[PDB]
Design an enzyme around this catalytic site. Structure first.
Site, PDB file in Angstrom:
ATOM      1  N   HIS A 164       0.901  -0.985  -0.366  1.00  0.00           N
ATOM      2  CA  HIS A 164      -0.024   0.097  -0.222  1.00  0.00           C
ATOM      3  C   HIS A 164       1.074   0.978  -0.161  1.00  0.00           C
ATOM      4  CE1 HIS A 164      -0.201  -0.348   4.416  1.00  0.00           C
ATOM      5  NE2 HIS A 164       0.239   0.911   4.445  1.00  0.00           N
ATOM      6  N   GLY A 220       1.935   6.373   9.785  1.00  0.00           N
ATOM      7  CA  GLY A 220       3.627   5.956   9.444  1.00  0.00           C
ATOM      8  C   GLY A 220       4.167   4.352   9.621  1.00  0.00           C
ATOM      9  N   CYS A 275       3.209   1.729   9.209  1.00  0.00           N
ATOM     10  CA  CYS A 275       3.337   0.386   8.416  1.00  0.00           C
ATOM     11  C   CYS A 275       4.654   0.092   7.887  1.00  0.00           C
ATOM     12  CB  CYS A 275       2.597   0.306   6.851  1.00  0.00           C
ATOM     13  SG  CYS A 275       0.728   1.738   7.812  1.00  0.00           S
TER      14      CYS A 275
HETATM   15  C1  LIG Z   1      -9.664   1.160   8.810  1.00  0.00           C
HETATM   16  C2  LIG Z   1      -8.034   1.198   7.941  1.00  0.00           C
HETATM   17  O1  LIG Z   1      -7.301   1.869   8.277  1.00  0.00           O
HETATM   18  N1  LIG Z   1      -8.444   1.056   6.211  1.00  0.00           N
HETATM   19  C3  LIG Z   1      -8.162   1.303   5.058  1.00  0.00           C
HETATM   20  C4  LIG Z   1      -6.270   0.505   5.230  1.00  0.00           C
HETATM   21  C5  LIG Z   1      -5.776  -0.557   4.529  1.00  0.00           C
HETATM   22  C6  LIG Z   1      -4.449  -0.681   4.743  1.00  0.00           C
HETATM   23 CL1  LIG Z   1      -3.657  -1.629   3.971  1.00  0.00          CL
HETATM   24  C7  LIG Z   1      -3.441   0.538   5.070  1.00  0.00           C
HETATM   25  C8  LIG Z   1      -4.393   1.922   6.216  1.00  0.00           C
HETATM   26  C9  LIG Z   1      -3.616   1.970   6.779  1.00  0.00           C
HETATM   27  C10 LIG Z   1      -2.874   2.176   7.639  1.00  0.00           C
HETATM   28  O2  LIG Z   1      -4.157   1.526   8.568  1.00  0.00           O
HETATM   29  N2  LIG Z   1      -2.161   2.691   9.163  1.00  0.00           N
HETATM   30  C11 LIG Z   1      -2.049   2.550  10.015  1.00  0.00           C
HETATM   31  C12 LIG Z   1      -1.693   1.486  10.669  1.00  0.00           C
HETATM   32  N3  LIG Z   1      -1.329   1.119  12.192  1.00  0.00           N
HETATM   33  C13 LIG Z   1      -1.530   2.137  12.914  1.00  0.00           C
HETATM   34  C14 LIG Z   1      -2.519   3.488  12.103  1.00  0.00           C
HETATM   35  C15 LIG Z   1      -2.565   3.368  10.720  1.00  0.00           C
HETATM   36  C16 LIG Z   1      -3.250   5.223  10.503  1.00  0.00           C
HETATM   37  C17 LIG Z   1      -5.394   1.677   5.618  1.00  0.00           C
END
Ligand SMILES: CC(=O)NCc1cc(Cl)cc(CC(=O)Nc2cnccc2C)c1
Ligand SMILES: CC(=O)NCc1cc(Cl)cc(CC(=O)Nc2cnccc2C)c1
EC number: 3.4.19.12
Lengths: 304, 304
Positions: free
Chosen positions: B41, B143, B145
Site C-alpha cells: 500500500h 507511518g 506500516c
Molecule cells: C480502517 C483502515 O485503516 N482501513 C484501510 C487501510 C488499509 C491499509 Cl492496508 C492501510 C491503511 C493505513 C493504516 O491503517 N495505517 C495505520 C496503521 N497502524 C496504525 C495506524 C494507522 C493509521 C488503511
C-alpha cells in the site's frame, strides 16, 4: 492507536555489553570508550559477600585478574579503579560501537528500559520504573548483575541504572553509573529494608490521559476535585501527593484531550474509592503507574 | 526472580530498518541482503485506498519511483515485484548489517517482539501475541506500516510479522514476510470483521507456572480437574479448548514446579469461576495470556 509498555530500541546498548570475570565470578560490564563499568561485587567470592571489605579485596587484584570479553574477543585491561560500588576497568581499546551517551541519576517515579544480560549477552528488554522506594520490579536472575537501565533521546543514550542485587523480597536494587546505589541499599548479604512504596500518582494520571486518547473513556465522570481533596484520597490509598509541578507536567496531555487535570483527578479519585467494577483500562484491571507523562506523549506521537 | 513482558533485544532488526517512499506515501521497509520488503500500500494515494487495483497501480511505477533510504544514505533500486501484499525492492547493495534470518509464519497464540518504526527509524520495542483471531493488540500510529514482528534463536532472527493496518476497532492486522495476511484481512479501506477472539489457555497456564516459580502462589488449591471438565469451564469463559498437545508443551513447567498440569487447570478453573477477589498475580489483576510456555522457560532460565 493502542498502548503498550514500550521499551527503547536496545541496539545502541547491546553494542556496549561485555562479560567481566574475576576469580570465580562472572557478570556483565558496560563498555563505553576505553572504560568498562561493572558492579564491584565481581571481585567477591560467596564467603566474602556477608561483610566484604571491598578496598582489601580489590588490593589482591591486578589488571590481569579482570577478564573482559566483548563477544568473542578479549579486551586488554590497562587500569582498574573503584568508584563507589562500580569498578572502572580501563581497556587499551575504545569500543567502536560506543554511542553518544550520558550518565544520569534518574528521579524516583521516572521510567527506563532495561537490557537484561547474562555472560555479556542480551536476553531481553523491558520497560520499568524506579519505584518511590528506589527499588525496581524487574526480571533478573543470577548472572544478570551489570545489566543496565537507560533512556534514549534522538541519538543519545542516557545510562541511569546498573543492576547489582536482588533483595530477599524479590525486588531489585542497583546503582547509577557512578556506583551510587539508588536507595539505602548496600552491596553485602545482609537484611535490607526496601521501605514503604507508593503509587506514582502523576504516572497513573498520564496513563488515564493515554486511555482517553486510545478510546478507553468509561472512567470519565461528571465530577471535579481540588489538589487538597484529591491528596486526602491519595494519602488514604498510598498514592504520592500530587503537586502543582505534577499538574504542570500534565499540561500537554490536558491540552491534547481537553480534560482538565483536576477533572482527571476526580476520575482517579472515583476509581480509587470504587475500583474498576470488573472492567479494564488499556487492557489492565489495575491502575498502571509505570508510564510518565513524557512516555505517554512520546508513544501517542510516535517519536523515534 | 521477577516476571516481565520482555521483548527480544532489537539490535539485529534496527540494522535492517529503512524508509521507503513512493509518490506521496512514506512507510518502513525491511532491508535483508539486497532486498527491501515493505507493504504494497506504499504505492497507493488516499483516494486509491477504497478499492485499489494493486496490479494497475504498480504498473504506473518504475524502480526510480521507490525511494529507499537507509539512515541517511540512498539505496539504488534495480528491481521491483509484488508478492501477495508486500513489495520486494531489489537494491544494488546487500545490507552489511543483515543478521542470520528466516521468514516464518507463526501460529495464533504465539508471541513475538515488535520494533515500532516511523520514517525508517525505531521508536520502541514491545512483546505481543498473535491473537486467536489473527489480530495483534499493538501500539502503532500512521507511518508505522512496515514495522516488523520477530523472534530470536541464538543468532537467527525469525521475521514473522509486517504491520499493514489498523482496523476500525483499534486492533492491528498484518502479514507474514511473504505478504500473506494473518486472518481474513485485505489491504483496502473497507469494513473488516476481526472475528471472535478467545483467551490463549495454554499461555495463561504457563503464566500461572511463572507465578509459582516467582513466589506468587495464593491461587494454588486443594483441587484437581480433568481435560473435559476444564474445557467445559474454558468454553463458558471464551478460553481456547486445552488439548493433550498443550498439556505436553507444559511438561517442562510441570516438571520444574512439581504441580501437575490438571492441578494447575483446577487453579485456573477456580480463578475463572471466582475471579481474583481484588488480589494480583505477577503484578496483574487479570489472567495474562501473552506468555507462551517457551517464553516462561526462556525468561525463568535466562537464555540469551
Ligand atoms: C480502517 C483502515 O485503516 N482501513 C484501510 C487501510 C488499509 C491499509 Cl492496508 C492501510 C491503511 C493505513 C493504516 O491503517 N495505517 C495505520 C496503521 N497502524 C496504525 C495506524 C494507522 C493509521 C488503511
Ligand atoms: C539477598 C541478597 O542477594 N543479598 C546479597 C547480595 C548483594 C549483592 Cl551486591 C549481590 C548479590 C547477588 C545477587 O543478588 N544477584 C542477583 C541479582 N538479581 C537477581 C538474582 C540474583 C541472584 C547478593
Amino acid at each position: 492507536s493502542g498502548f503498550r509498555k514500550m521499551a527503547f530500541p536496545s541496539g545502541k546498548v547491546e553494542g556496549c555489553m561485555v562479560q567481566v570475570t574475576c576469580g570465580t565470578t562472572t557478570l556483565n560490564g558496560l563498555w563505553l570508550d576505553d572504560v568498562v563499568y561493572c558492579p564491584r561485587h565481581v571481585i567477591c567470592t560467596s564467603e566474602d559477600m556477608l561483610n566484604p571489605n571491598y578496598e582489601d579485596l580489590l588490593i589482591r587484584k591486578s589488571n590481569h585478574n579482570f577478564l573482559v570479553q566483548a563477544g568473542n574477543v578479549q579486551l586488554r585491561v590497562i587500569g582498574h579503579s573503584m568508584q563507589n560500588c562500580v569498578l572502572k576497568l580501563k581497556v587499551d581499546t575504545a569500543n567502536p560501537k560506543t554511542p553518544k551517551y550520558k550518565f544520569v541519576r534518574i528521579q524516583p517515579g521516572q521510567t527506563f528500559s532495561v537490557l537484561a544480560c547474562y555472560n555479556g549477552s542480551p536476553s531481553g528488554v523491558y520497560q520499568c520504573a524506579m519505584r518511590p522506594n528506589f527499588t525496581i520490579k524487574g526480571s533478573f536472575l543470577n548472572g544478570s548483575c551489570g545489566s543496565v537501565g537507560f533512556n534514549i533521546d534522538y541519538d543519545c543514550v542516557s545510562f541511569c541504572y546498573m543492576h547489582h542485587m536482588e533483595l530477599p523480597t524479590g525486588v531489585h536494587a542497583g546503582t547509577d553509573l557512578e556506583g551510587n546505589f539508588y536507595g539505602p541499599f548496600v552491596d553485602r548479604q545482609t537484611a535490607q529494608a526496601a521501605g514503604t512504596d507508593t503509587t506514582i500518582t502523576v504516572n497513573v494520571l498520564a496513563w488515564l490521559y493515554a486511555a482517553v486518547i486510545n478510546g478507553d473513556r468509561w472512567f470519565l465522570n461528571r465530577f471535579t476535585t481540588t489538589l487538597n481533596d484529591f491528596n486526602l484520597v491519595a494519602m488514604k490509598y498510598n498514592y504520592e501527593p500530587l503537586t502543582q509541578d505534577h499538574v504542570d507536567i500534565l499540561g500537554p496531555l490536558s491540552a491534547q484531550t481537553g480534560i482538565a487535570v483536576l477533572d482527571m483527578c476526580a476520575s482517579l479519585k472515583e476509581l480509587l474509592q470504587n475500583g474498576m467494577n470488573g472492567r479494564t483500562i488499556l487492557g489492565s484491571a489495575l491502575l498502571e503507574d509505570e508510564f510518565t507523562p513524557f512516555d505517554v506523549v512520546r508513544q501517542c506521537s510516535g517519536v523515534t
